[PDB]
């Protein structure tokens, strides 16, 4: 009879260091969707617990000893500890969502949920077997997996905002799916240019697409599947290999497009208000 | 695109099983009898899945488990969409009041989950009322998830006899786990804790056999066949089986009276 | 010393055998009429050649077992047996030699260099997890092995005397097509009467006709997490196999290759 | 297809490497006086058996590097790299062939036979652990690295234009010699400046003048079994070796081969 | 068949580095009880050879791949034949208590040995089985652990002593004692201060009871305990545990507490037999 | 941090340069607070009478001039000059010179020294230590009866011997100063000519005491000044001899001067920490030839006029691995073989714990999970404890020895015991690396790791029994040997006809010997060593290969055999 047990994962990953922008996001959004102080509060809570939990779910399934330069929350309860502790947060959530007085707060939770795990869903199993996903396939997991979050919060807020303002809807979910395509494309360029688990990215892939009879890209990708991960010689390997082949250049325009049409929606969103 | 996220979810739900939450499910209209069994056949195969995977099971009722067919990890993906699933289950069930319901049920089941995790994993003994305050909500939590969700949708009338339900489905639970128990060493291999070896450990302060076989048990991922039926010796001698068949007798009196 | 290196070359010797190899050359020499020294010169170099590639793919499979008996690499390790496979090339070298023909070592280096391509994509397509195509897979079996028949026929034809050279290219259709019906018949036995991750011909059927069956492709990549399958999971295997086709599809297969190989054996009758 | 056949070949190509066999062509070329295109044929066979031996020689001693960059098999796998490595013995044959010399083939088919011998007998030193004698070290080295520079100095002297009667014999001792003092120069360099348990000079000489140190087999019995030498350890052995004396012997023995490598040289000089 | 194999991990691990504790405990002993040089040798050997063996037994229990910078026994001679030798050095200890000229000597001997093993036992079930001992039990086992080989000499040089000082059995005993507790907790502080086997100290038993809820800790320690080893960032986040409770500081109050102790029973001894001894009180100099 | 305060220091006032002949350039400096060297002085030769004996020899104390301390160490602190002070007069009363109260006392003193460098200034002190060791180790051990030849080979000695990095090293500790080894080999030439000085100082006016020395008696034949040098080479009388000296030692000392000029040319502009030192060292010159010229330890006769003007739990995890494997059914053979009823039931229990403890050890070196179809020990208990017990029941067993009472069971039991153990490690050896035992040694092994037990209790009971039977000795060792021999060897053959850890059995041998080429056993026998066991068809094989080699029967003739002998 307690919940020191429960509430363990929860708060370990709770007092490490963030970055903050899936809150400095509802901040943002406030400016256009004028709210009480009380339910962005609300909303950063359980934007905060859902990204806690996303992250105590992604290292178990990455085998990421580490978090932030600190060991992962597993790695000091157990795979099984922080597997029930983040299926509970999902129920704690759920009576978040109910506090936020709109019975249409949660059909945008119970859809967005399935979107996302959907997106996972298919991550997971591109990761499993080695089969590598087409540019626009992989693009559409991206748009669900990271920018699940952004979608889920922008509807819940222009859904408590005061009356007028509920037309203005199309336009802020475009912006958070291609800040959550953004925010996927450029983790990916800083961790290849600053693998161990054999994760499929937007370089990666254009490599194994323009080049069909590349050997050696396709055997160092299975030997890091077998043996578990990549040590460094063969990392600088692949490294090479997608300096050759262009993929680098080619992320960084993909990075450059997406940043254009973030600036355009901007711009919209502030011509119209 | 949802193949690999209902996949696991179809392939627990094809194996043959019991039926014991459907045989539980007031006069209630057969549609809503529908739902709640279909509420039930999800919360359960949710719950196997998570369960399978943490205790290592290659098998399951003969047939290979979930996480060896799909992984570990999609299993778990599978899981949290099956709760999210139940949770829009109970949307259409057209009740406001079954919400808050489920809601402190599963957050009493999730307790009851991580203190047993905990015991299992820390290879610390809880004591007989800690053993049996666990299983009392890791077990009935499902019963009594049920019997307060059966109440509210049924007409008037029925509506003080929730007390006598809840101790019922509490009741009931514990006699399932204690069943559960007392057949898987007269018909532990995973680090579980039981009723007899509680008592056997509580009773015995001194054995050190016993201890060291669990310990063994603890890093080598379980038993071999000689140091089981050890095990089953150590607690035939101190009088485990016996006082097992007890707590069986009297859970069964407290049902006649409940 | 000629000890540790033709050691494990005698083991693999010693074992019992079927010598199918020595049955077909014994079978195309009614037709090519040879003598008896030659066919038993041609008779050793099959042995020798057929040793080598058992040794060889014993070790590309973790086997420890082969004909009930222990592999040679659990005898004599692993390194000792790829040298003494390495040498058994060398030996047949000198074997051909003494066949007296120029044209001898040009057949046999083109038909090692088709067994050596066929053997690649083999080992390809089981390491990468990736599920060879019908056409590609029955490419893959003709080469690596009918190479053995091709080869041994070829240098038939030359060696037998003079005359009869038009009957080459039934002869080498024959042994291709003889050599696909002997992978086939294995296949049908093994999955009938997977461990390493080897593609079947029932399995590529299973994995082509449904493109979505997420059960058998999962139980396939646990095949290769674990390095091998415990026997429910092959019997599922086994189960899924037998809802789509995949059985009754091979012995059609089978039988096709049956009918073209009593055509060709017919064909052979009429121009001798 | 050739794409996974000739992957490992061209790979290990593709890598640096000091061209030591090159070199040797080209000086005995000065004697020889071959014609250009003969001396690129024997360059092209040179390097390809170097290839095909280091690609061997990484499997059958578990190092995942070489020349600070990744190996053959860890790009690969073993088995296609095994495969890559008996096609590269196949690919040999046609350009000893296309050498226009009948007896080019009976010396490749011979030194390749003592290569094997004597890889053959170091897998079975290194396996067992057993220690060989000075002697019995000392021949396997004459065959396995001077397997080589032999068989080139064979065919360069059966492809160079007339005379060449007596340099038949001095060229041959110099090859052995060579090969004999370049494999004591890279196991001291080694040593000096294991873990795979290799047994080399040094270490022959220090278990053969110490017949009673049960610190130095411990150690080795230590990396047998678990699989590789700490530091600490390698330290321990080095300090042994030193107490011994094993590494001024070893410097001696460097002393003693160039000095006959010196008077062969200055001999054939002499005699032309 | 003679010698070796059975020697060779006794010699090997008595070339190595040693500071040489014990030697001057007896050192500084003799003065006080002033016994002839070749008895004292007789005992200098007696303790390097019970040293020996118990650092040979304790680094294949502790999975230690190294000892003072240089490969351990059982890296370079195997467990079984290190536990040979190691059994071998009991029995050669036998052989020289009876060259002691003394049958009260053995008794001593077999009745300290008891007691060695006896606190062994409990250090390897706690260590084995993960269950955190009271500061009682662990006190008391480390007087019978580490203050064993102390208390085994002592009460054998004031046998052999010349007559009278044999009533000064008691301090030298009490003596023994806070030194071998005091010898074992600055070794816990320095390791912790300056776990991959898991073992239980001061600040951990401090730290475990104080907070009785400190889930992160038990759970780091079962991590060890299954992973066989903590990495350096779980090692970090032990360390900093063990300082937001106050552990480190519990163990200097309990290490001034125990010189306290060292410094009077010296003190009280000097009172009671003559001059200052001035090589206790320096090797108590060098902590 | 580097000044030479000179405010702490007392020049004299000299009017001929030459100090008798001696230092014609340079001062003298004397010490202020001149009290404490003489308070350090006499507490060393109180402690020296207290716990070595008595004095006789004079130290260094000056009444008229003044300590060594004071004259030759001008810049120390004066609170680190009565500890000074204390090493000086320590150095000359030992070196000149019932014997356990001499060596303990000895140990005392040293330690009483030790703590006061130590408890003033911890670093600078170590530094001090190690000085001391290279002046004592190269007295003793370095060769004194080996004689010299010339002068500049008997300086380079007569440098680390007398004083000179000793007191150089001390000065350090008055001043503050401390040296980095790169500097510290950088100066080392430039302070060289420097301690030649002080050396030779000495030596001319220690000639005098030097006399009553082995030309006073015969039974030491040997020196080691300058002068008789001198008289070696030149053999001048000590007049003209000691004037030869006087100028030489200008020019190692004049010398030193000059690279000390030199040095201030150079690098000496920015040398703030160095040139300090060097200032420092050229005070102990003409200090030492000032207070050598009226000191009474080396002119003895001035006693009474110097001496006069200076007073005015429990066993539950200890026996828990014992009791187990003392409960697992037997098929007790050693009981058999074994007078009183009590004395035979001793017996018993001692054969029994021993066998227990062979069995415990036994089982974790071999790996097996099982132990009479019932769990092994270390299964239940784990590899630590089972082998702290299997330790401890050794204990126990001699516990039970002495109770058998005899004092010569001791030494039986100890060479039984010492015998086990030599054939278990030899076992032990063969096992793991990989070799192959020839048939004798193999036999040989399984007489002392099996018939031990035997032979043991055979020689306790010819002991134990009374009297009567006298020559039952040899004939019953011979018989245990034969029977561990033979157990042994049955123990081989039916492990094989009704291996997974490598072990060498007798018909393994001689397969392995008669078939000198069989590579197959070799290899399967490596393959077993490697991965850890042999799988059946391993097994069969290697039972096949036996076969043929006819390994089988010759197990079985060693038994009808050995079954003859008995």
């Not at 199993?125 to 991206?142: A, F, H, K, V």
């Not at 859904?159 to 996927?184: H, N, R």
């Not at 082949?245 to 711009?267: P, R």
Request: glycine share 6%; net charge negative; hydrophobic share 35%.
């Amino acid at each position: 009879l307690g919940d020191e047990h429960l509430l363990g994962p929860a708060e370990y990953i709770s007092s490490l260091p963030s970055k903050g922008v899936r809150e400095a996001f509802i901040d943002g959004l406030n400016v256009w969707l004028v709210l009480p102080d009380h339910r962005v509060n609300q909303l950063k809570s359980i934007a905060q617990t859902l990204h806690n939990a996303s992250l105590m779910l992604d290292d178990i399934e990455d085998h990421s000893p580490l978090r932030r330069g600190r060991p992962s929350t597993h790695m000091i309860f157990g795979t099984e500890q922080t597997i029930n502790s983040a299926n509970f947060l999902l129920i704690d959530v759920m009576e978040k969502v109910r506090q936020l007085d709109d019975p249409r707060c949660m059909d945008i939770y119970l859809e967005e949920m399935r979107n996302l795990f959907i997106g996972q869903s298919f991550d997971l199993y591109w990761t499993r077997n080695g089969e590598c996903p087409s540019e626009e396939q992989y693009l559409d997991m991206i748009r669900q997996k990271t920018g699940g979050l952004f979608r889920l919060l922008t509807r819940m807020m222009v859904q408590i905002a005061p009356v007028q303002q509920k037309g203005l809807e199309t336009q802020l979910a475009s912006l958070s799916d291609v800040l959550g395509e953004f925010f996927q494309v450029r983790d990916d360029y800083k961790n290849l240019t600053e693998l161990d688990e054999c994760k499929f990215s937007y370089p990666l892939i254009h490599a194994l697409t323009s080049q069909p009879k590349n050997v050696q890209l396709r055997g160092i990708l299975q030997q890091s599947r077998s043996a578990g991960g990549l040590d460094v010689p063969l990392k600088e390997t692949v490294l090479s290999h997608l300096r050759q082949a262009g993929s680098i250049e080619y992320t960084e325009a993909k990075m450059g497009e997406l940043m254009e049409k973030i600036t355009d929606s901007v711009v919209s969103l502030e011509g119209e208000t």
